């Protein structure tokens, strides 16, 4: 069998509470959070059940993906390497390790289904540049995978189950909100398809699930002076309630693949505060994490990229 590296890339998460400072410093481009922000972040992580389980999900995704790829075809043996943006093991570290280990051919995938210039393209460029610097190692990079039918089906089936679970008055008066991580609006300068891809995800999932009433929102914007993609899910939820009185909101954060702070806090707390305030029911179906159905979707994405 031919040996190939499987470079799995993601933002990263802290491994313990004491990593919060450096992780958020990295996110904030060298700006250390002030003490009240540091305490606030610690509190948020405690509220969602702790930090330890978060980074384990990414590891489990990469490992299960490796094992599943190796089991479903007989031509290639994959070895997974994790490369993260904001904490060790960094993308450049992972590529250098691949080269050290004698890998000469790799395929990469970012654990975010929509292409953007800000994240996916930047991860892919960084990986390819380090390979070029070392020589003798090439990388083929998945750019997007939101339209993989098996992935669409994951979310459609979760959404169906959620609607099926609702009392009758909710089921005929619910709103589905599909979201991803906000990015600066200025990505539009380069024709970034990120927003169009989120809207297509939303269309595909709503259509597959038989949901006629849905909306697209953004969440978890950072803090810079230039505008970020909106509307934010908190504002969208309240606006849609005021205009049409929905009694239940279903949140599908399709941009995210795991139980991390952006979902467990930015949906399950921040959006839940809003639905609680307006008297609506809150639902947010299970994230993919490292579940077999999702791992099969990822495996299919990778093998399609290789033909
Ligand atoms: Mg494509
Ligand atoms: Mg926020």
UniProtKB/Swiss-Prot annotation:
Biochemical pathway: Porphyrin-containing compound metabolism; protoheme biosynthesis
Pfam assignment, any one: Ferrochelatase
Top-rank EC class of the record's enzyme: lyase
Phenotype for residue 181 to A/C: Loss of activity
Iron keyword on record: yes
Cell compartment(s), UniProt: Cytoplasm
A cellular-component GO term for this protein: cytoplasm
UniProt-reported outcome of changing residue 85 to A: Retains 92% of activity
Binding locations of Mg(2+): 18, 44, 266, 270
A biological-process GO annotation: heme biosynthetic process
EC number, UniProt record: 4.99.1.9
Effect of inactivating the gene: Deletion mutant requires hemin for growth.
Family as reported in the entry's similarity comment: Belongs to the ferrochelatase family.
Protein name per its UniProtKB record: Coproporphyrin III ferrochelatase
Species for this entry: Bacillus subtilis (strain 168)
